[PDB]
Amino acid sequence: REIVHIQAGQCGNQIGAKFWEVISDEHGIDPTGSYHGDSDLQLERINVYYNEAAGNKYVPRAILVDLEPGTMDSVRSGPFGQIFRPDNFVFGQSGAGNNWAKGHYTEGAELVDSVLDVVRKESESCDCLQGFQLTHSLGGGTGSGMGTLLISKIREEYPDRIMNTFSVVPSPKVSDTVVEPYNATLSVHQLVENTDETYCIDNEALYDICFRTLKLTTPTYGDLNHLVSATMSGVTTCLRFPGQLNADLRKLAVNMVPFPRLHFFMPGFAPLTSRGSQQYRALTVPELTQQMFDAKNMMAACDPRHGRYLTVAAVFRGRMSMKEVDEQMLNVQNKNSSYFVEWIPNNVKTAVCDIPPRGLKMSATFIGNSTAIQELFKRISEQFTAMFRRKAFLHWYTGEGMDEMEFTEAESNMNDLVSEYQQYQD
């Protein structure tokens, strides 16, 4: 029944800053820590993410990890940085510098032991864990590097808990680190087989949505990470709150994974349009389904109609009829039958929660597992190869002891995921 969340890397720490904000919004918990809500449900299932400390203080069940105090400090300095206890800030001193080898292989490795100890302390604080969630970037040093290391140890300690992670996937246009594909390649090599599932977030796609449908001209990462948190929070609240359908994360995982190795997801979100049009929108189930199916409302820079859909999850929040939902999902399946895989009859699955997100009447979360995902892997693998041949920045990595044959195997493994998507693309 409970979940532990660990954030890492500057990305992960800033995403989590919005995530937790939202969760407390959902439950009426004040930036200082106490509960000042107003709904029974708000406290009722609070356990999944909060420990109530003496005084009616709620402690977010999460660990903030970094290798630079300053980022942690900036998190702590805002509202909701006060709700986190000092003991959840685990950090070192001297960066990682966006270096996998430092993060995973060497220096960051050193910190992980202290992180894990706190993890253990929290695992004991829970009655019964459902699982763990981690937030991070695929091409980052602590985000992926150190984060991955941690994941391998947590999974080891808890094989029976859900291990998932959401991660920022290097967008085709904006890479920061020259070896960002290298770090990503290494994380695939480690993560894929050490996780139950991973979500693919593309900032470029997010920037398109924010202007494309939301028509906004000023977003920052906090605004885009709001959208990220909308999908993350969407998933777990249902599990928390009363609904109609089947509201268990593990069951979601079961329904979305047809094969042990292909567990990559494309998140999307509805409704998600500018205020101008809000006066011209109608709120129906087909309306949400139109926004959910549309590739432009995906947060991943993929194109599901290019690939084939293996699995689709449609999560609904708010009062909807069962009939309408059933029929519209069927219609989707029918009309987009050319994209769905024939091996899975009725490949579109649903989940229904009766609690709407604060401020909306209804909402829906799109989760997909298509073959289209392989295109991201292909882009990375290719870029990787070029760098691999030149050893760009690999003296930094090999200087910290990372061996090229390990990287070679990592490359293969990327290619293996692509070939397996092809194996089920048919």
Binding site: Q10, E68, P69, G70, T71, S74, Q93, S94, G95, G97, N98, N99, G141, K173, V174, S175, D176, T177, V178, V179, E180, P181, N203, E204, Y207, C210, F211, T217, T218, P219, T220, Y221, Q383, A386, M387, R389, R390, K391, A392, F393, H395, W396, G399
Partner: protein, 428 residues
Amino acid sequence: RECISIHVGQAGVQIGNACWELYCLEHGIQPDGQMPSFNTFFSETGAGKHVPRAVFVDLEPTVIDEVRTGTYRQLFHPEQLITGKEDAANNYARGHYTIGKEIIDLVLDRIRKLADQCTGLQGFSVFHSFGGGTGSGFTSLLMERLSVDYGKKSKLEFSIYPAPQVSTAVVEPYNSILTTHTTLEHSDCAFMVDNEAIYDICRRNLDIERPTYTNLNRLIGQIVSSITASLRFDGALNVDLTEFQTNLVPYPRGHFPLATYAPVISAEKAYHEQLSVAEITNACFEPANQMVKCDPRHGKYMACCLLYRGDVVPKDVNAAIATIKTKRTIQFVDWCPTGFKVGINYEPPTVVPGGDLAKVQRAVCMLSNTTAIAEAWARLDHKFDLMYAKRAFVHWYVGEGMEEGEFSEAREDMAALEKDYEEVGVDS
């Protein structure tokens, strides 16, 4: 999270003067150290005085005395102000060996003292010039020791690139060739700028036909502050110095990213003109704002880093990047995908009161590693060769214990470096 600045030689120190002046301007630091308000660079006293963590080295009393008699004399700790009595004479042989080697131990112990004052030394950077005696001679001597003691810390160097047309030092080729030999192998990254190119910037973008070094160093200071003050300040994408190294150095040789900076605009030029992030970055890929006289279109890019100040929205940056990747003629080396580091600070760009540059609301610094640098080496190759073939001025080094073979060797090391650029140029 701390770092050390090292100012060697006049060029190093006078640039430093501008740099520390700017840091004072960044926070309102009084000449006496009183700051009413950046402890990554500064060390605090119980009076609320902060000491800039830096070392000033000059083997001739005069420049340090200039510091000692100026306003910032109260700011600097007397132990930070290190001076010898005699000069290197434009000559590595004395700078690195005969003269500078005597005082360096003191210098190192002051550095070590500051290293002990640091709690989390991230690293350091050294300001100097490629042609001078202490500017390059002593400098490499220092690196020889610092790379031992601080082997895992950032070793970033900043140096003035010898102007192809004007140089006051006849044996500058010889000095620079010797430094190549010794710095390539010890340093992590060396950046450089060309005062001649800068003059062109001053006359075309600032509209000034009378630049002095005190103008020239303000502009340099701008660039440096973007990567030193604003990288410690808050932003969206807070990039560290180690991160810089980790995002700018692709090979274990050195590499030499060159600076480009846009906006560099006179107050009147700022009027009637609206810059966007994208427009500023367009300017960044123009030869016209290239801080080194070397043609960006000649070579191919290997690295590129863009660092943003003030009113920058990642949204706009992303669009800008898309166009520089696809619109421009920027050829790039295969090896590299276009992972250009984007640092995005909310920290606004700052301007020196009484300076030439206009108040801007946003600003972009660009670092880049292009294959055209080999031509710069080619320049040095022939200049060195000419002198060395005649053996002009050779007795000024030989008399200090230098070897002719050594000089040949150093040239050859440069040739090897050029060859590696050739290699990179070959795409693969």
